[PDB]
Amino acid sequence: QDSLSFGFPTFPSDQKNLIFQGDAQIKNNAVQLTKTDSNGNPVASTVGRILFSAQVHLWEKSSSRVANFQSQFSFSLKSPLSNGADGIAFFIAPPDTTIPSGSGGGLLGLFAPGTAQNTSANQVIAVEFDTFYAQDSNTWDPNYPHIGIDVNSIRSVKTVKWDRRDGQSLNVLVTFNPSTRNLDVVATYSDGTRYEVSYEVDVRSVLPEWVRVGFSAASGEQYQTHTLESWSFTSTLLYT
């Protein structure tokens, strides 16, 4: 299809079009990307991802068209600690993508250790909400919580300082305009606190014509829940 859209105001237990990978599962009408115990508390060493089953036509070589897409979602992070880790990310990748071996903790379940910073060895575009930046383990991160745009590497091509608020939902809007090639990210808390980051990228030189979209989250030695509360997505192939 030239156009595709779907909306999940909430996440009921009976899902049919979601691919669950790792520890991801539905609980209380929301997607818990990372594992939790019987009482709902986060645990260490856990990775989980979800992808929508239908493939998205991102660009078409024959017609020279590229899709304009918009992804709106909200999530909340909770932790008995304060140094919650490691973060959640919205990502776009080839349809057969699976959790790479040893991609836990700071790699967010998106990259393999040996190639995490090798741009010619990956095919992924992601928007990360990174809460852990210890310079000994996450050597690629700026020294503060941040939202970043990742293009084939865990070392973001662009970041903006961000504030982690335990238990508060963050509303996010990610848009890609093929005309200007800008990937824009706008995140806001209910009180109006806003964060923005953008970057120019030609998706055609990074990803295949057909892709899958979804979310990934992980917790290494430090932990927190990564609760995806709602998600809507729309893509339309356009001539520019």
Annotated binding site for Mn(2+), which residues?
A: 128, 130, 132, 141, 146
Among 130, 170, 178, 185, binds Ca ion (CB under 5 A): 130
Q: Which does 141 bind (CB under 5 to 8 A by kind): ligand MMA, a second copy, Mn ion, none?
A: Mn ion
55 binds a second copy (CB under 8 A): yes
Q: Which does 130 bind (CB under 5 to 8 A by kind): a second copy, ligand MMA, Ca ion, none?
A: Ca ion
229 binds Mn ion (CB under 5 A): no
98 binds a second copy (CB under 8 A): no
Q: Which does 208 bind (CB under 5 to 8 A by kind): a second copy, ligand MMA, Mn ion, none?
A: none
Burial of 198 per CB tally in 10 Å (0-12, 13-18, 19+): middle
179 binds a second copy (CB under 8 A): no
Segment contacting a second copy by CB under 8 A, of 48-56, 78-86, 174-182, 213-221: 48-56
Q: Which does 222 bind (CB under 5 to 8 A by kind): Mn ion, Ca ion, ligand MMA, none?
A: ligand MMA
* Known binding positions for Ca(2+): 128, 130, 132, 138, 141, 146
Minimum distance from CB of 115 to ligand MMA (Å)? 15
Binding site for Ca ion (CB under 5 A): 106, 130, 132, 138, 141
